[PDB]
Design an enzyme around this catalytic site. Structure first.
Site, PDB file in Angstrom:
ATOM      1  N   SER A   1      33.407  35.117 -14.176  1.00 18.07           N
ATOM      2  CA  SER A   1      34.294  36.158 -14.693  1.00 18.07           C
ATOM      3  C   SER A   1      35.214  36.722 -13.601  1.00 18.07           C
ATOM      4  CB  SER A   1      33.539  37.264 -15.427  1.00 18.07           C
ATOM      5  OG  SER A   1      32.648  36.806 -16.451  1.00 18.07           O
TER       6      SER A   1
ATOM      7  N   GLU B   1      33.230  28.361 -21.932  1.00 23.39           N
ATOM      8  CA  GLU B   1      32.949  27.027 -21.406  1.00 23.39           C
ATOM      9  C   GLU B   1      33.122  27.034 -19.886  1.00 23.39           C
ATOM     10  OE1 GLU B   1      37.374  25.602 -22.823  1.00 23.39           O
ATOM     11  OE2 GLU B   1      35.835  24.273 -23.651  1.00 23.39           O
TER      12      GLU B   1
HETATM   13  B1  LIG Z   1      31.184  36.706 -16.534  1.00 20.18           B
HETATM   14  O1  LIG Z   1      31.322  35.751 -15.554  1.00 20.18           O
HETATM   15  O2  LIG Z   1      31.060  38.029 -16.138  1.00 20.18           O
HETATM   16  C1  LIG Z   1      30.153  38.790 -16.848  1.00 20.18           C
HETATM   17  C2  LIG Z   1      29.765  38.462 -18.142  1.00 20.18           C
HETATM   18  C3  LIG Z   1      30.554  37.455 -18.934  1.00 20.18           C
HETATM   19  C4  LIG Z   1      30.912  36.259 -18.057  1.00 20.18           C
HETATM   20  N1  LIG Z   1      29.743  35.408 -18.207  1.00 20.18           N
HETATM   21  C5  LIG Z   1      29.359  34.914 -19.398  1.00 20.18           C
HETATM   22  O3  LIG Z   1      30.001  35.110 -20.425  1.00 20.18           O
HETATM   23  C6  LIG Z   1      28.077  34.108 -19.405  1.00 20.18           C
HETATM   24  C7  LIG Z   1      27.213  34.423 -20.612  1.00 20.18           C
HETATM   25  C8  LIG Z   1      28.734  39.192 -18.728  1.00 20.18           C
HETATM   26  C9  LIG Z   1      28.049  40.152 -18.007  1.00 20.18           C
HETATM   27  C10 LIG Z   1      28.391  40.387 -16.679  1.00 20.18           C
HETATM   28  C11 LIG Z   1      29.398  39.661 -16.064  1.00 20.18           C
HETATM   29  C12 LIG Z   1      29.801  39.969 -14.649  1.00 20.18           C
HETATM   30  O4  LIG Z   1      28.967  40.139 -13.732  1.00 20.18           O
HETATM   31  O5  LIG Z   1      31.026  39.924 -14.432  1.00 20.18           O
END
Ligand SMILES: *[B@@]1([O])OC2=C([C][C]1[N]C(=O)[C][C])[C]=[C][C]=C2C([O])=O
Length: 267
Positions: A46, A145
């Site tokens: 993210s 993805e």
């Molecule tokens: B992500 O990289 O950041 C984030 C999410 C969503 C993204 N990951 C996913 O969707 C995997 C299921 C959810 C909670 C926390 C984070 C973060 O630490 O940025």
């Protein structure tokens, strides 16, 4: 001296958690840097949302976009982990609010909507990064993805150094004008997901803006931050981690401790 000690400390940290730790930190007041695996590839997860937010603000500043324009998505099948966009589905959200939600809550619905409508998808996001002189970053895929984080896969990766340099340009440099840069910084300062990472590694009275990522696989997680210490030039800290097995869980404490170590190395 202090650089070599720090390196041994990270190396021991990464063996302790059975994974790989990538670090790049910059003291902008003194120019001192510390790097560990800083040119190696790590999944973005993210964390690229923080850059996506900057790209939106770049468009707004050029007046191609209005920060206040309404974004409607009433019929959309909202992606998993859309905490903010799910609440406002019926009414829509301003562009500014959607972009800051992508950043501050890691909202995936916000991310994908912005990439489909305004940024030209992953390729466009990648073009934005090329345009500021980031040659390492690549975004290949969409939410969710892009979080697979499979060992050996170069899709959706960057390096700690490029991440650090990019954040410096965007948060502290001249890609955004004075007014729009100030908005960007306040978005970063309001991030909600970073309490146990870089934030946990510094005095409480330092001001921090950050963006986290959590792939949810291969113990893959990260955090990058701009840090304003009291009466002193800003620091930039970029922390990336991966683990060997699919089911391995990420380690907030490892990230925080790598942060502590990096910060020591550059002060
Ligand atoms: B992500 O990289 O950041 C984030 C999410 C969503 C993204 N990951 C996913 O969707 C995997 C299921 C959810 C909670 C926390 C984070 C973060 O630490 O940025």
């Amino acid at each position: 001296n202090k650089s070599d000690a720090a390196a041994k400390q990270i190396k021991k940290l990464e063996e302790d958690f059975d994974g790989r730790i990538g670090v790049f930190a910059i003291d902008t007041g003194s120019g001192n840097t510390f790097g560990y695996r800083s040119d190696e590839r790590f999944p973005l997860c993210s964390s690229f949302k923080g850059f996506l937010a900057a790209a939106v603000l770049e468009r707004v500043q050029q007046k191609k976009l209005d920060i206040n324009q309404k974004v409607k998505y009433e019929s959309r099948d909202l992606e998993y982990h859309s905490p903010i966009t799910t609440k406002y589905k019926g009414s829509g959200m301003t562009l500014g609010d959607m972009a800051s939600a992508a950043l501050q809550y890691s909202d995936n619905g916000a991310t994908n909507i912005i990439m489909e409508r305004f940024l030209g998808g992953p390729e466009g996001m990648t073009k934005f990064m090329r345009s500021i002189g980031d040659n390492e970053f690549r975004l290949d895929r969409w939410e969710l993805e892009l979080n697979t984080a499979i060992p050996g896969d170069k899709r959706d990766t960057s390096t700690p150094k490029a991440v650090a340099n990019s954040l410096n340009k965007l948060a502290l440099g001249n890609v955004l004008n004075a007014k729009v840069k100030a908005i960007y910084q306040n978005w970063l300062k309001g991030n909600t997901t970073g309490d146990a990472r870089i934030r946990a590694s510094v005095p409480a009275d330092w001001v921090v803006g950050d963006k986290t990522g959590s792939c949810g696989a291969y113990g893959t997680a990260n955090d990058y931050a701009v840090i304003w210490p009291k009466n002193r030039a800003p620091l930039i800290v970029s922390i990336y981690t991966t683990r060997k097995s699919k089911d391995d869980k990420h380690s907030d404490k490892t990230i925080a401790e790598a942060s502590r170590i990096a910060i020591q190395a550059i002060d």
